[PDB]
């Protein structure tokens, strides 16, 4: 206490407390996960039903960036939208300067530099979201996960939110036992359902073969197959 | 620039709005006989058909600038309710062709309103005294009455400051 009331201050331990409080804010968010398959990535998120009055399929949470990057986040949803808006600006600027779409690791670095910059100055607040994002580019599928600190790493599978631990317990089993995109969607649904222990399951994915490397949402028959597999 | 945990951010002018015109009145309350009474401009014109009874000077300058700008841009008189927003406790009174005579005090329209330390009793006296059939004469005399316990806006005269001795004698 005393060193945690401002964003630019180190405590005697060398820890920045405002970033850790932003992590606490992330822990309150709903569970969202990402899974990397042999040729793509899959995104899923637990959308809690606040009331029966919400239109049941139009409060989209997973966001696309450019055309090949998908982003899902947990925590302060408006901060996630702010981060995704910055990511879209970065990707558009890269495509303007360079006609190739922004590589996924390059995009991850741009977002990490932006998020970390919010941990430098006292006049700004850290992002209250951990963002799973990824896509398919010229060199395969990439899955990343930001932290409010600006830290990020590549992952074989990622989870964050209130149920992040339960979801990780199943991501570890997936990696140990394997995972193609078709099976990846069903396993993502299973992981979300298991970690939830009303809600709407939203799924998305980008695979080189099954989407030609473009990010698409799971809808209709495939979504229902994933849901019944999860119920099974 | 902060909210309280309960969610809320951390003289006497009397006006009566009649259908024949609005009347405003103020207690000059000069500090001494030396002060030039003429210089107490506590009722001011904002536009040809708008005036107010009271940072004051700056706000009044910006209100006048906005009103004249609207007149220049549209060749029309600014609606009082629009002015309140586009623009001390205020009584803003004026006329327009949309809703006619108005008086405002976040701004809420009023049929009649009092501000200042006497507001808490003048409000009850207004509630007991105000009625729709008031003609400008009774509106003036009732302004004076509630002061005891001038200016007007009309379509023919516009905003003007009062004569005054006579209306006091008629009280």
């Amino acid at each position: 206490t005393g060193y945690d009331l401002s964003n630019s201050v180190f405590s005697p331990d060398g820890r920045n407390f405002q970033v850790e409080y932003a992590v606490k804010a992330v822990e309150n968010g709903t569970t969202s996960i990402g899974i990397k398959c042999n040729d793509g990535v899959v995104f899923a998120v637990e959308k809690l039903i606040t009331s029966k009055l919400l239109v049941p399929q139009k409060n989209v949470k997973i966001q696309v960036v450019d055309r090949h990057i998908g982003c899902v986040y947990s925590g302060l949803i408006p901060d996630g939208r702010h981060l995704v808006n910055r990511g879209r600006e970065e990707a558009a600027s890269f495509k303007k300067l360079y006609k190739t779409p922004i590589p996924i690791p390059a995009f991850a670095d741009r977002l990490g530099q932006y998020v970390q910059a919010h941990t430098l100055y006292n006049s700004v607040r850290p992002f209250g979201v951990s963002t799973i994002f990824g896509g398919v580019d010229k060199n395969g599928a990439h899955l990343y996960m930001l932290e409010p600190s600006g830290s990020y790493w590549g992952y074989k599978g990622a989870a964050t939110g209130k149920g992040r631990q339960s979801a990780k317990a199943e991501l570890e089993k997936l990696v140990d036992h394997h995972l193609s995109a078709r099976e990846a969607v069903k396993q993502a649904a299973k992981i979300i359902y298991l970690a939830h222990e009303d809600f709407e399951l939203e799924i998305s994915w980008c695979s080189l073969s099954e989407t030609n490397g473009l990010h698409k949402f799971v809808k209709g028959d495939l979504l229902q197959e994933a849901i019944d597999f999860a119920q099974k | 620039s902060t909210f309280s945990p309960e969610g809320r951010l951390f003289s006497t002018a009397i006006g009566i709005a009649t259908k024949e015109g609005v009347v405003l009145g103020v207690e000059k309350r000069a500090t001494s006989p030396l002060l030039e009474s003429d210089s107490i401009e506590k009722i001011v014109e904002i536009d040809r058909h708008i005036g107010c009874a009271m940072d004051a000077r700056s706000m009044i300058e910006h209100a006048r600038t906005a009103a004249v700008t609207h007149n220049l841009y549209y060749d029309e008189d600014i609606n009082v309710e629009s002015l309140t927003q586009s623009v001390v406790a205020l009584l803003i009174a004026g006329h327009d062709a949309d809703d006619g005579y108005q008086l405002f005090h976040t701004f809420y329209r009023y049929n009649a309103k009092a501000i200042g330390s006497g507001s808490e009793g003048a409000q009850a006296e207004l509630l007991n005294e105000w009625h729709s059939s008031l003609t400008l004469k009774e509106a003036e005399l009732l302004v004076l009455k509630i002061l005891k316990q001038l200016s007007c806006i009309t379509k023919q005269d516009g905003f003007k400051i009062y004569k005054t001795a006579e209306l006091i004698k008629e009280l």
């Binding site: 201050v9 998020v115 100055y121 600006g150 | -």
Partner: protein
């Protein structure tokens, strides 16, 4: 308020800079750099706590330039900020002065930025210690290390991390008994790994180490498969 912004305390100390020093150890990984006859080697512990991480991405060794490499001790966000700034400075030098930035020039420029953070109260110091390695076109193999206070100096060999003193003690003993005299960069890499093992008393797999080698006209990082060959050669 002398402990919250970079201003002098009655002792003349800058407590914020000293706390930024504490932050450098919070990643809990040790690294060391040694100079060979004609090449420079950097060794760093790649501690990976989570099985879901892609180890390819976990890395604190940066290729600043064709010739300069940088290893960072401290939080990865600040480390990446420093690496990006160093890459930008090296490119700007190559542009303005027509030749590759020397390693020591880059270290001085980075230490000057660090000192600026220690002088302007609006900006906090980065909790990173930067170690630049290269084979300079003039001075040969070089190690330069910059710290949050804006201090830097060249090294014969250096270590950084929680167990810095033990590694430095081992290197001091070897330098007393003996640069590292070897004929190819593989042998000096094996020597550096051997002394890392001995000082830390912990065997390493190909997953536990990240290695960067600075040679003439190239700084490159060893893949896990190359570190596997090096560990095998040590086992022999």
């Amino acid at each position: 308020y002398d402990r919250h912004i970079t201003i002098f305390s009655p002792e003349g100390r800058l407590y914020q800079v000293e706390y930024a020093f504490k932050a450098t150890n919070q990643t809990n990984i040790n690294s060391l750099a040694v100079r060979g006859k004609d090449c420079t080697v950097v060794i760093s512990q790649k501690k990976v706590p989570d099985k879901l991480l892609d180890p390819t991405t976990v890395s604190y060794i940066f290729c600043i330039s064709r010739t300069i490499g940088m290893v960072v001790n401290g939080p990865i966000p600040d480390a990446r900020n420093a690496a990006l700034r160093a890459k930008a400075e090296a490119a700007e030098f190559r542009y303005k002065y027509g030749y590759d930035m020397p390693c020591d020039v880059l270290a001085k420029r980075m230490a000057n930025l660090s000192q600026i953070y220690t002088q302007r109260a609006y900006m906090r110091p980065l909790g990173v210690i930067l170690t630049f390695v290269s084979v300079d076109e003039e001075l040969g193999p070089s190690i330069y290390k910059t710290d949050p206070a804006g201090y830097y100096v060249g090294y014969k060999a250096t270590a950084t991390g929680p167990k810095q003193q033990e590694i430095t003690t081992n290197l001091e003993n070897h330098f007393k008994k003996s640069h590292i005299n070897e004929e190819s960069w593989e042998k000096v890499v094996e020597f550096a790994i051997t002394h890392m093992i001995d000082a830390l008393g912990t065997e390493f797999s190909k997953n536990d180490l990240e290695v960067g080698v600075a040679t003439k006209d190239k700084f490159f990082t060893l893949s896990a498969e190359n570190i596997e060959e090096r560990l095998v050669a040590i086992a022999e």
